[PDB]
């Protein structure tokens, strides 16, 4: 049994996964209801629920921004900014105990599900200390927080001049809601394969960014000086032209700004070729890993 | 003979195709005239006809939309909308027993060929009940339908206020004519290989769309809030910015809308790289299958 | 010696190249001076000359079009059209026995080299009948012809009303000069490998064009009807939208015309993905051949 | 020991690296402090310093161009040109013994490090003659020079009418500062793998450029004549259209100029496909080498 384990690790057939139960025999049993969808029919249903749950939050998150509805705000004409209208304009919902804001309800509804997932999952974990080394528990935590950041801003604060301390910092938090989408990782097998391919390429991915950081700087400058002697130049500075080379090394290619001089085109056309020769060097490094981690289940 | 068949299936040399005739001995014989082009010279000719047939419909379909001819319509100046002018403007041809509309003739001509293909092929099929599991018979059916839907709209309807019930539903049908192009599958060997490669990738293709659906939502939002505090922003909402990230993860890159702020470019430039790292993960999954299904004839 | 040749052909080590000399013993000897650069120092020199010759013609061809010089034409203001100014405006040079046009000299100089290559190569060929099956002799012929087509229009014609018979047909010929660039094939080893890779892919390349021809039609139509109900639509017809889908299946992506409606974007964004899934299916079919034909010299 | 070395070279396990010390025993000992970071803690620190050094110069180089600061120049309004304001406008810093220009200090500070790297590295080299064959010493030299070219222009010249001799030649030098970024090659292992992959591809890379040079010329001309008979054409000449085909063979795709005629689109759409069939032929030639040179450390 000892030289067989050294054989499979060389082979890579290393599956040491053994889910220990919580030992309560119902603290154990209910734990497996929320750790394994394959134990029963209703065990699937929880996954069937929670996968659908995340989508409901997202559509509710995206529709707040819609100008059928953000133009149907408290500032439907958009004249000033109030302390209570800051929530309708920079938090995207109207907090009220009456809760006439429909989205503010729908936002809140999923959070009740997420904690009752998570907290019940926290109380029934066998491994208590190493709970926060698991990455698929971290996303659970970061999801539920700007909910509470919203409320403590509303409940605790009864004062003036709070926007001069932190107001766009609140607007940062309105983004960071967006990484609730990573909660699908617990359900998709395939999204974890991305999560492992990146985990197995964190140095070779750094070959890409560093080779692009070289490519950006070299050709942003070299086009800036060939487009230098215009009064009418589209390239005012070199950190303007960092936007230009990533538009043209990644071959997206926009048209917002394009070189105009005879030299700036000759410079500009090398950068089109060299972006192929910068992305494609460490891409098949990655994709061979992803192909390997995909069929590694077989 | 028993352990040889288990050998070839492991190998993949599994060709169990055996075309049974219809047994009529002319019901059988004429069936093979319209199932196999290789039985005779004229057996090729039917395929040589029917391949040329489909093209004639397409050019006749596309030229209806041309403003040498849709501007040479009954509303050549475009003032109003009549019940009979709905056919020339939303069905694309003028139905008449005189049939002065030339395209309306040419459209009708191919349909006579298609049924006389199909209906004769229906009566001479050996497999009678399993006729509608064959996908290359489904396209035959979907081709001939909006022809009849056009006529029943003309024949049965003599009444007022029909556009308030279904008029854009008619305009849907004018699209669905377009999938007559898939009828070439019966003739091209290579188009069926695409039909099989997709048939062997319907989960791994779903890795692509789901990894892109992740990529779209994450960066559409993250550019929306870095482009937030403009009165002059090109990004009014987040479902506006779903158009933006598929223009920029697929590296098409249009120029209709591009970020402008300092933050929106830094967000916007990550999304150029990440679209490479989203398409290219399950593409060589597919292309290895297609290369495998191509030479599988050898 | 017989089962060794069957071995190498299976292997692919099939090099039956045996250059028979012209047998004149100076017709033979001068032949190797103009077929093999490796026989001597001066044998290289002709190859060094003729490679430099082609470039001289090209720069002379491209500079005619330059508006430092085509605006310095006989119609420097561009008011009318003369029969003698047709050469300076649609043949790009001024033919005269004085030949004051400098480019018209430089154009003429190279043709003297090409024939004295070719005609001397014609008279000293061992194989006289199969001379015109060799493709690298066809390019020799097609190069020298529109030179003579230029002169016969000048020399033979002294009459009126020739532009109503053929005038843009002359302008066709001014293009077809451009395939003089393929004359480098006799000199580059690498350009012939492209010439062989295409020669070994003429069916599998046809998988690409036909899969793209499917992709173009299916999405040009499907965006035309989602962009139909505008008075302000960017898509007037469907053969307008053939330009649109090759801008967007090949992911070039211009911005001349982009969909605007909610449906036209959803249609338009599928076509971005599907162009990856159309180019990349028969590309590694080709590139595996090119990699094979490249190192086939080793 | 003799047939083992012939074995490893076939294998490619050829590591003949033997760093001979300078033999001074402190000239030797200090040499390893500036050639090997792995000898000690402080040996790392010099590499930790000098990697951070280069970045400081770059940010200082890029920020000079910023119109928070180049508009805060001596010509903050930009009316004329002085002999002393040429440094603030075309050398990017204000040279003085007072040195009130802050960047001109920060520029100067890094050069003191680079020479004290290099000159100390020069005096302690074992190999003195072949010092300038090593490429990672050339980059050291070309870095430090336009610093001195700046000073000798200021120190030696006290005269008039120097701009009519060389003024944009000075502006050339302001670019050539930019290749100080290649100094990271001594530190990154991965950037040298790029440096070796290009060193192992200098003929096969030339397959790419020459196949593109063919592709550019053939389609720039062929679109010029299909877009010829406009008064309103976007393509004035053929070397205008060299910018067009590299925008469209590399599939960047800008929108600055796009064909408009019916023929110019049919020409223009072939060039989209053919740029895929020109980049992708010698790319996996390269990327296989880079993948090989990456893991060649293992």
Numbering used by the authors:
A (entry chain F), B (entry chain H), C (entry chain B), D (entry chain D): 120 to 417
Show the paper's wording.
To obtain maps with a higher local resolution, we performed particle subtraction, followed by additional classifications as well as 3D refinement on the cytosolic and transmembrane domain independently. The additional two maps showed higher resolution for each domain (3 Å for the cytosolic domain with local higher resolution as high as ~2.5 Å, and ~4 Å for the transmembrane region with local higher resolution of up to ~3.0 Å), which we used to build models of the Kv channel. Although the transmembrane domain exhibits overall lower resolution than the cytosolic domain, we see cryo-EM densities for all transmembrane helices (S1-S6) with densities visible for many of the bulky side chains, which enabled us to refine a model for the entire complex. In addition, the central pore domain shows higher local resolutions (3–4 Å) compared to the peripheral voltage-sensing domains (resolutions of ~4–6 Å), with the lowest resolution for the peripheral loops in the latter domain. Overall, the transmembrane domain only shows minimal structural differences when compared to the crystal structure, suggesting that the X-ray structure is representative of the structure of the protein in a membrane environment. For the intracellular end of the pore where the activation gate resides, we observed no discernable structural differences between the cryo-EM and X-ray structures. Within the external pore region that has been implicated in C-type inactivation, we see no evidence for significant constriction or dilation of the pore. In our structure of the Kv chimera, sidechain density for D375 (equivalent to D447 in Shaker) is weak compared to other nearby residues, including W362, Y373, M376 and V377, raising the possibility that the critical hydrogen bond between D375 in the P-loop and W362 in the pore helix may be broken.
